[PDB]
Design an enzyme around this catalytic site. Structure first.
Site, PDB file in Angstrom:
ATOM      1  N   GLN A   1      60.299  21.137   5.628  1.00 13.74           N
ATOM      2  CA  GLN A   1      61.869  20.585   5.201  1.00 13.74           C
ATOM      3  C   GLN A   1      62.945  21.513   5.830  1.00 13.74           C
ATOM      4  O   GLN A   1      62.854  22.726   5.319  1.00 13.74           O
ATOM      5  CB  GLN A   1      61.738  20.530   3.676  1.00 13.74           C
ATOM      6  CG  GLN A   1      63.004  20.349   3.167  1.00 13.74           C
ATOM      7  CD  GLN A   1      63.210  20.291   1.725  1.00 13.74           C
ATOM      8  OE1 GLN A   1      63.142  21.512   1.109  1.00 13.74           O
ATOM      9  NE2 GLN A   1      63.356  19.050   0.940  1.00 13.74           N
TER      10      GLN A   1
ATOM     11  N   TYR B   1      72.692  20.557  -1.610  1.00  7.73           N
ATOM     12  CA  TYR B   1      72.882  21.786  -0.547  1.00  7.73           C
ATOM     13  C   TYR B   1      73.846  20.995   0.595  1.00  7.73           C
ATOM     14  O   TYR B   1      74.725  20.143   0.374  1.00  7.73           O
ATOM     15  CB  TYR B   1      71.550  21.899   0.073  1.00  7.73           C
ATOM     16  CG  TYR B   1      70.462  22.512  -1.145  1.00  7.73           C
ATOM     17  CD1 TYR B   1      69.546  22.040  -1.592  1.00  7.73           C
ATOM     18  CD2 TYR B   1      71.029  23.760  -1.301  1.00  7.73           C
ATOM     19  CE1 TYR B   1      68.870  22.681  -2.663  1.00  7.73           C
ATOM     20  CE2 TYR B   1      70.172  24.459  -2.633  1.00  7.73           C
ATOM     21  CZ  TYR B   1      69.165  23.719  -3.012  1.00  7.73           C
ATOM     22  OH  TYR B   1      68.475  24.508  -4.211  1.00  7.73           O
TER      23      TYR B   1
ATOM     24  N   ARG C   1      65.593  13.657   2.735  1.00  9.39           N
ATOM     25  CA  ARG C   1      65.559  13.717   1.502  1.00  9.39           C
ATOM     26  C   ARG C   1      67.249  13.695   0.860  1.00  9.39           C
ATOM     27  O   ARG C   1      67.906  14.357   1.239  1.00  9.39           O
ATOM     28  CB  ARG C   1      64.956  14.902   1.016  1.00  9.39           C
ATOM     29  CG  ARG C   1      64.534  14.688  -0.499  1.00  9.39           C
ATOM     30  CD  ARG C   1      63.681  15.762  -1.238  1.00  9.39           C
ATOM     31  NE  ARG C   1      62.851  15.276  -2.217  1.00  9.39           N
ATOM     32  CZ  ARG C   1      62.360  16.078  -3.190  1.00  9.39           C
ATOM     33  NH1 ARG C   1      62.818  17.323  -3.295  1.00  9.39           N
ATOM     34  NH2 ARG C   1      61.409  15.460  -4.108  1.00  9.39           N
TER      35      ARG C   1
ATOM     36  N   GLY D   1      55.593  17.150  -8.157  1.00 11.34           N
ATOM     37  CA  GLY D   1      55.915  18.565  -7.971  1.00 11.34           C
ATOM     38  C   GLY D   1      55.151  19.344  -8.779  1.00 11.34           C
ATOM     39  O   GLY D   1      54.315  20.042  -8.426  1.00 11.34           O
ATOM     40  N   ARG D   2      55.620  19.645  -9.887  1.00 12.74           N
ATOM     41  CA  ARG D   2      55.554  20.719 -10.973  1.00 12.74           C
ATOM     42  C   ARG D   2      53.486  20.379 -11.175  1.00 12.74           C
ATOM     43  O   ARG D   2      53.175  21.106 -11.402  1.00 12.74           O
ATOM     44  CB  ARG D   2      56.125  20.572 -12.178  1.00 12.74           C
ATOM     45  CG  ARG D   2      57.430  21.061 -11.960  1.00 12.74           C
ATOM     46  CD  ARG D   2      58.696  21.004 -12.922  1.00 12.74           C
ATOM     47  NE  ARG D   2      59.160  19.816 -12.774  1.00 12.74           N
ATOM     48  CZ  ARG D   2      60.297  19.187 -13.347  1.00 12.74           C
ATOM     49  NH1 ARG D   2      60.935  20.127 -14.166  1.00 12.74           N
ATOM     50  NH2 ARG D   2      60.829  18.331 -13.030  1.00 12.74           N
TER      51      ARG D   2
HETATM   52  C1  LIG Z   1      59.058  25.725  -7.935  1.00 14.59           C
HETATM   53  C2  LIG Z   1      59.899  24.391  -7.448  1.00 14.59           C
HETATM   54  C3  LIG Z   1      60.689  24.826  -6.140  1.00 14.59           C
HETATM   55  C4  LIG Z   1      61.472  23.639  -5.660  1.00 14.59           C
HETATM   56  N1  LIG Z   1      62.327  23.958  -4.394  1.00 14.59           N
HETATM   57  C5  LIG Z   1      62.540  22.666  -3.831  1.00 14.59           C
HETATM   58  C6  LIG Z   1      62.789  22.799  -2.402  1.00 14.59           C
HETATM   59  O1  LIG Z   1      62.505  23.786  -1.493  1.00 14.59           O
HETATM   60  N2  LIG Z   1      63.356  21.492  -1.700  1.00 14.59           N
HETATM   61  C7  LIG Z   1      63.461  20.362  -2.398  1.00 14.59           C
HETATM   62  O2  LIG Z   1      63.820  19.466  -1.715  1.00 14.59           O
HETATM   63  N3  LIG Z   1      63.082  20.316  -3.662  1.00 14.59           N
HETATM   64  C8  LIG Z   1      62.856  21.387  -4.412  1.00 14.59           C
HETATM   65  N4  LIG Z   1      62.181  21.327  -5.692  1.00 14.59           N
HETATM   66  C9  LIG Z   1      62.248  19.868  -6.192  1.00 14.59           C
HETATM   67  C10 LIG Z   1      60.739  19.206  -6.165  1.00 14.59           C
HETATM   68  O3  LIG Z   1      60.696  18.648  -4.816  1.00 14.59           O
HETATM   69  C11 LIG Z   1      60.784  17.942  -6.801  1.00 14.59           C
HETATM   70  O4  LIG Z   1      61.876  16.714  -6.498  1.00 14.59           O
HETATM   71  C12 LIG Z   1      61.034  18.032  -8.363  1.00 14.59           C
HETATM   72  O5  LIG Z   1      60.315  19.235  -9.040  1.00 14.59           O
HETATM   73  C13 LIG Z   1      60.914  16.615  -9.214  1.00 14.59           C
HETATM   74  O6  LIG Z   1      59.411  16.485  -9.167  1.00 14.59           O
HETATM   75  P1  LIG Z   1      58.424  16.692 -10.601  1.00 14.59           P
HETATM   76  O7  LIG Z   1      59.148  16.371 -11.815  1.00 14.59           O
HETATM   77  O8  LIG Z   1      57.222  15.884 -10.151  1.00 14.59           O
HETATM   78  O9  LIG Z   1      58.153  18.194 -10.563  1.00 14.59           O
HETATM   79  C14 LIG Z   1      61.488  22.273  -6.529  1.00 14.59           C
HETATM   80  C15 LIG Z   1      60.599  22.214  -7.560  1.00 14.59           C
HETATM   81  C16 LIG Z   1      59.881  23.191  -8.082  1.00 14.59           C
HETATM   82  C17 LIG Z   1      59.047  22.937  -9.428  1.00 14.59           C
END
Ligand SMILES: Cc1cc2nc3c(=O)[nH]c(=O)nc-3n(C[C@H](O)[C@H](O)[C@H](O)COP(=O)(O)O)c2cc1C
Length: 364
Positions: free
Chosen positions: A99, A185, A232, A321-322
């Site tokens: 990314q 961003y 994205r 994600g999480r």
């Molecule tokens: C620890 C952490 C760091 C994140 N950093 C980024 C990132 O580097 N780039 C991005 O596009 N999304 C980032 N996200 C967002 C996730 O890609 C994702 O869209 C978001 O957590 C929602 O999905 P979830 O509810 O399944 O966790 C981050 C989320 C977590 C939990």
């Protein structure tokens, strides 16, 4: 969960399932140099049962960085560091995209060599914080700084940085790249009307607000091929300060614009942390028509909701994600309905192996 475990073609790749490990910043890069390292390689390899892994955001230049200890993708050492990661992931039979990141105004001078942040305009992201390195291994959260508006030269430079970063990702062994044009961003700062007050060709009209995205994508495709470029977007979340007046029109148009470039996939960040706005099915269906490639959605999905999204024709792949942070074998757990471990917020950023590679696989 049947459709979730169906393979899918992504360009020249044939992925194992529809599960995506979305990009997630862990701020574990080696210092000095912000270099991807061994623990990160283990971390991603542990989660290689995903159909596709998208790396955490990796900055395209020194001034594209917004958080302490995130891995870069512009120095030879950084490329080599990522190479160890992609080798580890490929040895497990998974595909991985890098990314490419530029945070724009969402940063602090401490993270970009004391420089002032850049953005579409001079608008500071309201109620937003990032974290820096403050002589300790615990993220120090600080308010973002006021940015300076990008000049024509700045625009050319950033496009050049993105283009080279794409080539660097290929040299690092990545299967493709994902343009981070979401979560408030840099590119998102041009797209959303309330974050863009430019009076030139990069602001003032919908076509103008999408121009930077258009030119960056044009450069990425030219550099490595449309089949290796994903993008994205975050149409409705506003957590990091970017709000658009007419998201449906803006993002449906963005999707159509990206469709012209034939990008391999469009990834929608549906939820950002606790910012989970209602995302109308009608809107999702409009995106499905505007963009005809592989559509990925991430944000509070569970097995049931993911299967439903795919079966209703709204999504082709779903990112978790999480849950992937705490469950290295998430796919297996989703398929069997095994209970999911939960992640520890305190170890999401910074530190070492703890809270990164020591979440165990399921054991009855
Ligand atoms: C620890 C952490 C760091 C994140 N950093 C980024 C990132 O580097 N780039 C991005 O596009 N999304 C980032 N996200 C967002 C996730 O890609 C994702 O869209 C978001 O957590 C929602 O999905 P979830 O509810 O399944 O966790 C981050 C989320 C977590 C939990």
């Amino acid at each position: 969960t049947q459709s979730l475990f169906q393979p899918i073609t992504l360009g020249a790749l044939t992925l194992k399932n529809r599960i995506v490990m979305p990009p997630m910043t862990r701020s574990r890069a080696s210092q000095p140099g912000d270099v991807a390292n061994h623990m990160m390689a283990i971390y991603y390899a542990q989660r290689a049962s995903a159909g596709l892994i998208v790396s955490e955001g990796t900055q395209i230049s020194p001034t594209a960085k917004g958080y302490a200890w995130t891995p870069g993708i512009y120095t030879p050492e950084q490329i080599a560091g990522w190479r160890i990661v992609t080798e580890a992931v490929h040895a497990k039979g998974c595909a991985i995209f890098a990314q490419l990141w530029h945070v724009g105004r969402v940063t602090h001078p401490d993270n970009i060599d004391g420089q002032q942040p850049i953005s579409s305009s001079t608008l500071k992201a309201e109620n937003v914080k990032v974290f820096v390195d403050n002589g300790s291994d615990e993220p120090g959260f600080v308010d973002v700084a006021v940015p300076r508006a990008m000049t024509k030269a700045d625009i050319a430079q950033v496009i050049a940085d993105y283009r080279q970063a794409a080539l660097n990702a290929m040299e690092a062994g990545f299967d493709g790249i994902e343009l981070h044009a979401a979560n408030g961003y840099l590119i998102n700062q041009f797209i959303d009307s309330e974050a863009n007050n430019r009076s030139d060709e990069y602001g003032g009209s919908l076509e103008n607000r999408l121009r930077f995205l258009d030119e960056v994508v044009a450069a990425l495709v030219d550099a490595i091929g449309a089949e290796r470029v994903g993008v994205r977007l975050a149409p409705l979340t506003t957590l990091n300060g970017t709000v658009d007046a007419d998201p449906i029109l803006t993002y449906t148009a963005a999707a159509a614009l990206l469709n012209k470039h034939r990008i391999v996939y469009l990834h929608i960040a549906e939820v950002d942390w606790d910012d989970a706005p209602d995302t109308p099915v009608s809107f999702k269906r409009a995106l499905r028509e505007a963009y005809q490639g592989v559509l990925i959605y991430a944000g509070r999905y569970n097995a049931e909701k993911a299967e439903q999204a795919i079966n209703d024709g709204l999504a082709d792949m779903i990112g978790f994600g999480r849950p992937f942070i705490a469950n290295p074998d998430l796919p297996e757990r989703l398929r069997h309905g095994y209970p999911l471990a939960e992640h520890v917020p305190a170890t999401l950023f910074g530190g070492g192996e703890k809270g990164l590679t020591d979440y165990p696989t399921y054991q009855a």
